[PDB]
Amino acid sequence: VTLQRNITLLNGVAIIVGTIIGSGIFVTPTGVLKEAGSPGLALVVWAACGVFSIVGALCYAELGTTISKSGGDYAYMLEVYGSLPAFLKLWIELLIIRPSSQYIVALVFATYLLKPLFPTCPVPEEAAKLVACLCVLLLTAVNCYSVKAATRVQDAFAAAKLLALALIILLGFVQIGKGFEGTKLDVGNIVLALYSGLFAYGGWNYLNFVTEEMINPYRNLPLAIIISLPIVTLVYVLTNLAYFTTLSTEQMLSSEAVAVDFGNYHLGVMSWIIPVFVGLSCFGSVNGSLFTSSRLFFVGSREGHLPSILSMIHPQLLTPVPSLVFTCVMTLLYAFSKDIFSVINFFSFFNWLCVALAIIGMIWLRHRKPELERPIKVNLALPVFFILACLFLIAVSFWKTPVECGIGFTIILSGLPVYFFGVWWKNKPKWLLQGIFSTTVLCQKLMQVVPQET
Amino acid sequence: TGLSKEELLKVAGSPGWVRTRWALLLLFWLGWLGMLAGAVVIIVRAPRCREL
Ligand SMILES: N[C@@H](Cc1ccc(N(CCCl)CCCl)cc1)C(=O)O
């Protein structure tokens, strides 16, 4: 069997717009405004970080249609830097970046969804963790049954976000109808203000991790980026403009969840509307992050980096069942760690590093292989502008927050041992090979799954 | 590398394995419903925030 190309142009938009927006816009603005220090300059960095996002994604629109392959930012460096550099990324994406991101966003789903049953006090931890995990389990099942089901789910919760942010913008314009100061302009500060948007816009690369599942990627991938990411930019500046109609700097810079207080200010009878919409927003972000992660671990196994259980597909339903089950188990195993919001911050920069290495690889390929076909090309200034902007922002981390870095960098270096034993060694002891094969065929028999035919 | 497709056809249709999948795809859904009932019990058996 082979994975059929079920993602339409519209579903391709819902994969990206439905996973960019997530929790970011409804909880982040306080953390922009703390470093901007002014409602004038805050609305500047929200646009400027948008521009950085468009030029980044436009580099990925090219890169993805030059390679024309589903492994996203892993494939696009495997084709360049080779086996071990791609493995270091894959190990980190498999063990840390993606299980943590799924789990915390599933937690954001739970804690906001329960919030109107606990309006003024923290929701109980067991209820949050159960509800978070029930989300990850249910979405895994939906992703196992049908690509058609999971993509038609992704529409609903892409729409849910745009409806929620439409409700924010609607209330904002209603307050304008009813009826730059203080700025901390320091050249060494405002770069940290721009960094705050690279949680809120982050995720525009997700559509590249599913390239081989779009109906006609040479049109759909660049077009879905160009339809999506400018719309997000517009929605964010209008959404922040809306918040600044209602909440003063002193409210916004202190408040826990700016959109919920905005909801309480206007919608007194039904104030739970925004809390539940931030919840449902997150449910779609998890779905997309889970769908998209499954493809990475699957692709990694084709190209020889991971055990050959994860390359298998279920013949009756045509989904990479072992990859989704692995994704889920590895995410639920993450849930009981304590200091997660340190973890995902000290690894925050590793995503930007890899995005930079990918577009560096794209220019290195435009030198070494003019032989490759390129159905769309970008003028080389934009990549160079984008790599300058990336490597500038990586450097900020080591000025403002270097202290954690060794704990993260230890795991990156811990990728090398596992590469040698798992991939370079080729399993010389035949008793270990028989154990691997035994383990494999148990999964085969159990899940009813088989390798892909090209 | 793992097992052949056409090799797997010889084993995967055995009643033992079909009964095994029927049991597990019941036990997963049952276990999810277990966590759901659990979560609802936590939400009942917890002290509500005092009003302002
Ligand atoms: N905008 C998102 C948040 C987000 C952004 C970037 C990442 N990534 C890694 C840094 Cl945690 C990208 C690779 Cl998973 C993950 C999550 C939302 O609001 O759901």
Residue numbers in the entry:
A (entry chain B): 44 to 222, 233 to 507
B (entry chain A): 162 to 213
Lines quoted from the article behind this entry:
Among them, the L-type amino acid transporter 1 (LAT1; SLC7A5) is notable for its broad substrate specificity, transporting not only essential neutral amino acids such as ʟ-Leu and ʟ-Phe, but also the basic amino acid ʟ-His, non-essential neutral amino acids ʟ-Cys and ʟ-Tyr, bulkier derivatives such as thyroid hormones (e.g., T4 and T3), and amino acid mustards such as melphalan. In this study, by combining the lipid nanodisc system and cryo-EM, we have resolved the structures of LAT1 bound to different compounds in three major conformations, outward-facing, occluded and inward-facing, delineating the transport cycle and the structural changes associated with inhibition.
Given the successful structure determination of LAT1 bound to JPH203 in nanodiscs, we next determined the structures of LAT1 bound to a physiological substrate ʟ-Phe and a slow substrate melphalan. Our study has also revealed the recognition mechanism of melphalan, a chemotherapeutic agent that is known to be slowly transported by system L3. This is consistent with the observed slower transport rate of melphalan and other large amino acid derivatives such as T3. The transport process of these large amino acid derivatives may involve a “loose” occluded state, where the substrate is not as tightly confined by surrounding residues as it is for BCH, yet it could still be translocated across the membrane by a series of conformational changes.
